[PDB]
């Protein structure tokens, strides 16, 4: 009721383009069409492929009146035991960051300007029998940041070698 939404990935219906770095090697915009409605997600799953440091940054969001924003994530993480021999290079977490700016820097992404909010861990991993039966465990996690002081902000997601699908990213403030 009293919430004002500033960013909503799933409501955009695949139309938000989030920046990825390194380009073409990590996070990817995916779709699933097994229901009446298409489902979109940002996914990465380079679990047995050497060290990973894959970044995904949102579009610029004008904060307006918001002083404190609340960030709600919905996501799946596959069990590292789904991947044979990967008990060393496979992870089940990813990291959430943000940055404030008075202008949209566009494709200029400088990870050095971003502040870490938290490591995001799944309450429930999706095990192989789930995945193979098309029955994922969707996690829901919320964080907040503030006071905000510039005109707008970005969120970013860092993958360190997990098998993660981001299905919902909703940012709001309370009026």
């Amino acid at each position: 009721p009293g919430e004002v939404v500033l960013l909503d990935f799933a409501a955009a219906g695949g139309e938000l383009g989030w920046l990825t770095h390194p380009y073409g090697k990590g996070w990817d915009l995916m779709q699933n069409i097994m229901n009446d409605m298409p489902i979109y997600m940002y996914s990465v799953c380079n679990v047995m492929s050497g060290d990973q440091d894959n970044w995904l940054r949102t579009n610029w969001v004008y904060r307006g009146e918001a002083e404190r924003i609340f960030i709600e994530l919905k996501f799946t993480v596959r069990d590292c035991n789904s991947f044979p021999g990967g008990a060393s290079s496979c992870k089940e977490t990813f990291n959430l960051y943000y940055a404030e700016s008075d202008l949209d820097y566009g494709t200029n992404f400088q990870k050095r300007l971003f502040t870490k909010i938290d490591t995001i861990a799944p309450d429930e991993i999706t095990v192989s029998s789930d995945f193979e039966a098309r029955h994922v465990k969707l996690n829901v996690e919320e964080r907040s940041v503030g006071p905000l002081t510039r005109k707008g902000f970005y969120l970013a997601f860092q993958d360190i070698g997990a098998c993660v699908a981001l299905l919902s990213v909703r940012v709001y403030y309370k009026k």
Partner: peptide, 11 residues
Amino acid sequence: WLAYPDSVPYS
């Protein structure tokens, strides 16, 4: 490996 079942790149 796929992070999500029956998902394909969207572009």
